[model samples]
Target: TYTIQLSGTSEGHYYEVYHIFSGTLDTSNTLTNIEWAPGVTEAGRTHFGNASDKAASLSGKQNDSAEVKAFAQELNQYLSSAGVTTVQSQQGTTTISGLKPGYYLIKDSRGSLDNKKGHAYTSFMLQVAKDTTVAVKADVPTLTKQVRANGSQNYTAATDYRIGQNILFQITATLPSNYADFTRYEFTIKDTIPAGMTYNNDAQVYLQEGGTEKDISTFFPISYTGNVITITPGDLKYVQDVKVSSKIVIRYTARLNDDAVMGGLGNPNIARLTYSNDPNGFTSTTAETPDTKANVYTYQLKVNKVKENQQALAGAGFTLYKKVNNQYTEIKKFEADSNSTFDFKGLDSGDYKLVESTVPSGYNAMKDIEFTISGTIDSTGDLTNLTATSATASFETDVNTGIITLKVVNKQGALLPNT
Candidate 1:
């Protein structure tokens, strides 16, 4: 009696074994004699004869899918005639029995566990004289992590964010397709907060499956410590039963603090993922490195209040509105500084209008100042060209301070001769 055992890091794999006999086992004859079956013809022996020798001649020719498939079918028929049974590895280990002293072929019928890519076949030949056990192993699947900024899902590269802006980050992770087939799956994500950024406590995690979302935050809580935000999954027992989504979505909001630096390399953040695997009945946890989609965050807008020329004019109260649903919604309200320019710190890139709520002491209140704020911030995290356009007044940007200067001319009214 002989035994053939199979195992591997790849779980949930099915297999088939083919036993070909050139002739009946006997001491007088070697195990390589060509014998004829009931319906065996000359052409049949040419391919199935001396199975070991034939396999050697066709070795390394499996790249031709057509030929390999044909050989597989022929072997099936050959093994069927000989009454040799096929086997499957249910939980990573399977053993074959009832074999005479002879040579046989062990081939993985279902290929590797990861069928997403091209076919990965594992096959070999073995000879057995006494009770013996032949074992083999398979490979595991690939994993990945992706992220997004605000509501934009297409941004996979670095991004630009403004100061005081509530930047919401959406992270999605994909598990292996056959993950549920296994008995265990545990994972953790570690996100590091960037410079001049604060983690919002309203972070949430969800399991999205079949177009429905299940809030998993109640079970798997997120914690922050030492500038690192760790999202640790619950117990392994729960993870195995839960129907995890093909893409697990995690949402969190962050605020850019005053210390945030501006520029291409400003406020860069990154994240990584780690997990444990129990494939093949052997427990081994491995961690995979990952990166963040949005690389930077830094921006600000300055509103200048000045006279018709370059003269600075104070005592001007202004209101900033964001165009929401075709209606101007108030976002911020501030007064011009003593220098005649009010810096709207921590602003995002969008459309806005600045209206003079209260004009200078002697000047009349002008119409609403409609302006658009859009630009790539500089090293100072400052955005330029945020000014109001009015025919009666003029607006200019200071090249040095990046501050807008709105000209408010105090047109004096002359009095008529004493009546």
Candidate 2:
């Protein structure tokens, strides 16, 4: 005799198992002499007319998910008054054995997980030729947020960018197995832009199926209010060219503006997806995926111009250059309060050099001071460590604000002979 084991469900959830038809099995696991169960209500027989014909019609078509789900849902009404064997799913699993091989119907009799975030009700399941295990097909969509350098393909939890630079952000969501079971499905994502960033006003939604991707932005109503971005994709039931496994991917741009944080823990962008959980189509009550996040970081360079006596030295102009392809290219720097101190803002992790563009009179023009800035991030892309080093010069770092400091001391020297 074959058994039915219900697995992968939460505790306190239960199932109402109904034996719709009974028959003898052969070596091929095919049923013969199909007959309605003893407790089959008159309503069940009257609706389907005869058991043999109905069983034969559905005998080898279990793989056809749509038809079977429709049949099970329709037949569930008939099985209501009939005798049912209930099993309380405990410890996430339940099993019923010692039954004759036949067609059976399983319904989510209880609403234990209805409208629960990250949980839902399975559709009516009709199994032909009693099986060993039946995995409930019900789930909630998952939310995942990732970020990368603008125009880059590799997306990760965290990234480093400079101010005024465009950063690429994306949100990914999965469709529940029973997504089609809902009459009115609502799917939306609520993303919060970091304080140091601003949305670029362009968000694209795509329906991804393996290697193929189709633009589905037309079905969405996008809006940005008070640093929060909302993408409401209304009803998914009528979306065209989408499948149960078709995942929703949204990519957008946000610029690290001038007000971006210098360092510390970096700026974080967080988001979560809300979707219809009730297969019965109740919009007000829904589920949400756990919050997913992406953190970004920027850095600054502060140079303190000084003389041999450790005092401010005026009239000395400085220029900064970042290392690119083993060549130092000139970068921008602004005066910090005075000409003796300069500030180079919005710098990513890299090597840079400081040039004494205009030296004080009789200072023997100082040489270029080279240094490298580097950082370490944790598993979730948090800036765990910030560090900068230089073999030619000594420097210091800020703990709260991510700013690297260098003391450039110029020693007094003899002047050139009168020209």
Candidate 3:
């Protein structure tokens, strides 16, 4: 005989139970054939074997061979329902005892057993021999993270960043409300900063208490060194004394340096928790949560300042403008190089226009060129499929080399005889 229990499920949910016979003798001390269904009833079995309502009241010992066959067929029909028993009121637990020494299946009688997010559910079978106790509980929890600019503006996955800008990164680790009982609960979060980002020494840690956020910064020890941030409880005293809550948060800041590598090498942060629900089985168990990253990308504008013949023109000055609100705002100015080309770096991925602020000594001033920088950033924070296009000018991009070449033809007509 054995006892089975179901727990850690949402309240008001329903469940079903079943038994699988292994072609073995039943507890009745008989070599019974394996044919009965889960919910087979005594009355249903009696009705199956009787003929014309005459043998319905007959005892099992007096039933004829034909009646026995009928009873067995009816028993199979009842068992086919799949629910041998229905759970009663008890949100925390549902248990069944005195089960035969065989295999039994336990499943949700309602909809999907694992419909909730951040949860894994599956029906299980129990192999019974000696009197034993077994339990089934689902695993549920979610980890999330975010990055903010200047301590306020949230940094999206594809936003561009300026050199020396301060960025704040935050992560929240959540535990299920009905998490299984534990002898010791331990949680630690780690975030590995990407290159070009410098970690700050200051950090904040907090937890919720009585529906209000309480700062636990000094209560725990937080470390930020070598582009990595780790938040951990100094001792088991805090977690052991405080009641369990759903959310634990860690916040820190970092700087984007001038040498920071840009373009789709996203700054990703990961978090995990280790706990002990059962000292023997679940001790030192680790749960790796999903990852979150910040994407800081930069754009480049390449201008080929030339005459009708493809020649590099030096001494030509240009300016770049970004669309702000409804008007264009000049951001930076540059002069063409000896290669007769001008290259502007550290630009945002958006719409912009370039004007020839000053023309070469003998060439006519070219028209303003409008273009857009568009593409996607992957999880690793690396930019991919980047492209630039202009509607009024001719430009070509080398997809393999990430180079943009723009042609600006200058007309040298009628420099003749200025009156």
What are the per-residue Cα lDDT tens digits for candidate 3 across 49-122? 32223222323443224444344333333454543655542555666666664434454453332332232332
Candidate 1 residue-wise lDDT, 99-205, digit = tens: 65554555555323332231123433333333444445333333333225434655343445566667667666666444543455556777878768888877787
The candidate maximizing TM-score is: 2
TM-score of each: 0.53, 0.75, 0.58
**Model 2 vs. true fold: TM:** 0.75
In the order shown, the candidates' Cα RMSDs to the true structure are 13.6, 5.2, 14.0
lDDT of 2: 0.77
Rank order (by lDDT, best first): 2, 3, 1
lDDT of each: 0.54, 0.77, 0.55
Task: Give the winner by TM-score: 1 or 2.
Answer: 2
Q: Write the per-residue lDDT of candidate 2 for residues 194-309, one digit (tens) a residue.
A: 88998998999999999788999898879999899999868776676777889889899998887888888788888988787666423356767778999888888888888888
Which 10 consecutive residues of model 3 have the lowest summed lDDT? 274-283
**Worst ten in a row by lDDT for model 1:** 111-120
Hey, what RMSD does candidate 2 come out at?
A: 5.2
Instruction: Name the candidate, 1 or 2, with the larger lDDT value.
Output: 2
